[PDB]
């Protein structure tokens, strides 16, 4: 049998319906449901603004690897 | 003879200058390879800065220890290590004639990666002589770590 | 700028048409053409026969990880 | 000494290849630092223009760095 | 007992020759496994070159140290 939502997993039982549920890494994990992929809303860093230091880049942008990185478009 | 056992810094600075001159010659000959020489003069140019550790006592003793370690013990280690590496590389190329072990250079690099903890023991490919390859790789790893252990211990009797 | 088939690659020039050609790992590599994926013909090990000791499994089978493995159907 | 070696080889690598994870000193410094902690990358899957010169630089860097680590370990035995 | 605790090199060279002869026998018996035997002989053929480190004092002492480290302490670790 399987562990249902809210039941303890990995101590003899795995979670069922893995397309919707997962067993976290918590030493007494309980089966939890996935969340929808909500795109990045406001309060993000726009193109040309500093990222990494308290603000992440918006949905269409990426933050390079630098001491003071700035958001830039994908590719 | 004295250059072989003394006055290394003059040789290293001279080699740096030779690389610079070759870079100039390639630059004016309409070649892209002048970059390849230039970087070899650049990297050496930084390491030669350790020459100036003399004039400070602690860094001078440290640099002298580096020099003598390289010139005494690492040569004896590297001779035996290279013999073992070449032998097992030839064995592996002979056993497996294709698929990342089709050349001696590639096999030598792949076996060298084990010495630095970046090996590959997945055994995913469909070779003809699988399960003989595994024995060779295990033996190579064990012997290489014996050699490294012996080097480390040999450097403790000198302290 | 690019190297053609049979020309020296990686010493300042990359080989063009990488969908059909590649630069090997040889310390003075020359650009070579890919080969077609010919399926496994006879002189292979069939299901239930010993693999690894001088004979690979045929294209429809896989060789497990063991001291004396035997060919088996894919998972 | 370690930082001297790291900066020198980082500058050489960035000059030789100015693109694809080696377009800045920060990224190249981190990538070379990874080799010191056993997390390196010697796959050489990218199609660089100066491959087989990049390989020689990386091998020399790794060998020198491990010589330095060994020398440190030996030197610290003179206090016991 | 003196066969094994002394004169290892004779045993190693003899085992190399045994691998070569088994390779020949498999070769003329129409078997593909001879390659396996051959490669083992080849591998041993290189490591046995360490025998010639005698006649050079520093390399000879280094090789003696390797010998005793293998034959004394590693066998306790591996168990
Ligand atoms: C990209 C690839 C880079 C490779 C570079 C490799 C590390 C460079 C390190 C540079 C350091 C410069 C230096 O300081 O050179 C070192 C040499 O280090 C080496 O072993 C280099 C191996 C070749 C000391 O040599 P020194 O000129 O001091 O000669 C000593 C006499 O002065 C003294 O009077 C005594 O007679 C004594 O016996 C002599 O030794
Ligand atoms: C594919 C897989 C390969 C496996 C290869 C494994 C390592 C090869 C190492 C090759 C070294 C060859 C050699 O030269 O062998 C060495 C011994 O190292 C070993 O073999 C270790 C085997 C464990 C010298 O042994 P030696 O014949 O000199 O006998 C000594 C006397 O002479 C002396 O007077 C004393 O009485 C002393 O106690 C005796 O020992
Ligand atoms: C040197 C090698 C060690 C590497 C791994 C160390 C991991 C330690 C975990 C610390 C911790 O903080 O572990 C907490 C308690 O778990 C335990 O660990 C119990 C034992 C505690 C006794 C030490 C959190 O676990 P939890 O309460 O189940 O989380 C659910 C709530 N969401
Ligand atoms: C011990 C192991 C170390 C591993 C990591 C070392 C990284 C060093 C960075 C070198 C560098 O050269 O880093 C540049 C200089 O800045 C600094 O980092 C200052 C701090 C220097 C003091 C160390 C990065 O500056 P940047 O503005 O982000 O460059 C983007 C261009 N617009
Ligand atoms: C310590 C670091 C260990 C890892 C790397 C070791 C690689 C060594 C290569 C061994 C070899 O056997 O590589 C040969 C050439 O190696 C040389 O560069 C010779 C220079 C003289 C010094 C050896 C193969 O020759 P090739 O022309 O490259 O083959 C292509 C033709 N089809
Ligand atoms: C230090 C590095 C070790 C890494 C490799 C680990 C080897 C242990 C194998 C244990 C085993 O139990 O391996 C079995 C015995 O074989 C031998 O190994 C013979 C030598 C035994 C003397 C050591 C093989 O049985 P099998 O092929 O899986 O049988 C199919 C039915 N399943
Ligand atoms: Na590692």
UniProtKB/Swiss-Prot annotation, chains A, C:
Localization in the cell: Secreted
Protein name as annotated: Tau-theraphotoxin-Hs1a
Oligomer and partners: Interacts with TRPV1 (2 toxins (4 moieties) bind 1 channel (homotetramer)).
Domain repeat residues: 2-31, 42-71
Tissues showing expression: Expressed by the venom gland.
Listed transmembrane segments: none
Residue numbers marked as site, Important residue for activation of TRPV1: 25, 65
Disulfide partners: 2-16, 9-23, 15-31, 44-58, 51-63, 57-71
Chief location: secreted
Keywords: Disulfide bond, Ion channel impairing toxin, Knottin, Lipid-binding, Repeat, Secreted, Toxin
Residue span of region 2 X approximate repeats with cysteine pattern C-C-CC-C-C: 2-71
Keyword Disulfide bond attached: yes
GO cellular component terms attached to this protein's record: extracellular region
Domain of life: Eukaryota
From Swiss-Prot, chain D:
Compartmental location: Postsynaptic cell membrane; Cell projection, Dendritic spine membrane; Cell membrane
Transmembrane segments: 1-17, 53-80
Residues that bind Ca(2+): 41
All ranges on the Extracellular side of the membrane: 45-52
Residues that hold Na(+) 2 according to the record: 38
Post-translational modification: Phosphorylation by CAMKII seems to regulate binding to vanilloids. Phosphorylated and modulated by PRKCE, PRKCM and probably PRKCZ. Dephosphorylation by calcineurin seems to lead to receptor desensitization and phosphorylation by CAMKII recovers activity.
Intramembrane segments: 22-44
Tissue: Predominantly expressed in trigeminal and dorsal root sensory ganglia. Expressed also in hippocampus, cortex, cerebellum, olfactory bulb, mesencephalon and hindbrain. High expression in the cell bodies and dendrites of neurons in the hippocampus and in the cortex. In the brain detected also in astrocytes and pericytes (at protein level). Isoform 1 and isoform 3 are expressed in brain and peripheral blood mononuclear cells.
Position of sequence motif Selectivity filter: 38-41
Effect of mutating residue 41 to N: Strongly reduces the affinity for pore blocker ruthenium red and lowered channel permeability for Mg(2+)
Amino-acid positions noted as binding Na(+) 1 in the UniProt annotation, renumbered to this chain: 38
Domain notes from UniProt: The association domain (AD) is necessary for self-association.
Subunit structure, as described in the record: Homotetramer. Interacts with PIRT. May also form a heteromeric channel with TRPV3. Interacts with CALM, PRKCM and CSK. Interacts with PRKCG and NTRK1, probably by forming a trimeric complex. Interacts with the Scolopendra mutilans RhTx toxin. Interacts with the spider Tau-theraphotoxin-Hs1a. Interacts with TMEM100. Interacts with PACS2.
Described function: Non-selective calcium permeant cation channel involved in detection of noxious chemical and thermal stimuli. Seems to mediate proton influx and may be involved in intracellular acidosis in nociceptive neurons. Involved in mediation of inflammatory pain and hyperalgesia. Sensitized by a phosphatidylinositol second messenger system activated by receptor tyrosine kinases, which involves PKC isozymes and PCL. Activation by vanilloids, like capsaicin, and temperatures higher than 42 degrees Celsius.
More details: Responses evoked by capsaicin, but not by low pH and heat, can be antagonized by capsazepine.
Family from the record: Belongs to the transient receptor (TC 1.A.4) family. TrpV subfamily. TRPV1 sub-subfamily.
Name under which the protein is recorded: Transient receptor potential cation channel subfamily V member 1
Organism: Rattus norvegicus (Rat)
Source lineage: Eukaryota, Metazoa, Chordata, Craniata, Vertebrata
Residues represented out of the complete protein: 583 to 685 of 838
């Amino acid at each position: 049998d399987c562990a249902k939502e809210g039941e303890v997993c990995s101590w003899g039982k795995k979670c069922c319906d893995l397309d919707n549920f997962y067993c976290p890494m918590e030493f007494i994990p309980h089966c939890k449901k996935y969340k929808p992929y909500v795109p990045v809303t406001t309060n993000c860093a726009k193109e040309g603004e500093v990222c990494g230091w308290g603000s992440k880049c918006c949905h269409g942008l990426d933050c390079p690897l630098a001491f003071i990185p700035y958001c830039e478009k994908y590719r | 003879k004295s250059l072989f056992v003394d006055s290394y810094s003059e040789i290293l600075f001279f080699v740096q200058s030779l690389f610079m001159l070759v870079s100039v010659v390639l630059y004016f000959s309409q070649r892209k390879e002048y970059v390849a020489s230039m970087v070899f003069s650049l990297a050496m140019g930084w390491t030669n800065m350790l020459y100036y550790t003399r004039g400070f006592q602690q860094m001078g003793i440290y640099a002298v220890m580096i020099e003598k370690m390289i010139l005494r013990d690492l040569c004896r280690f590297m001779f035996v290590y290279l013999v073992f590496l070449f032998g097992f590389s030839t064995a592996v190329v002979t056993l497996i004639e294709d698929g990342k072990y089709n050349s001696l250079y590639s096999t030598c690099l792949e076996l060298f990666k084990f010495t630095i903890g970046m090996g590959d023991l997945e055994f995913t490919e469909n070779y003809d002589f699988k399960a003989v390859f595994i024995i060779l790789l295990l033996a190579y790893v064990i012997l290489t770590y014996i050699l490294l252990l012996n080097m480390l211990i040999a450097l403790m009797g000198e302290t």
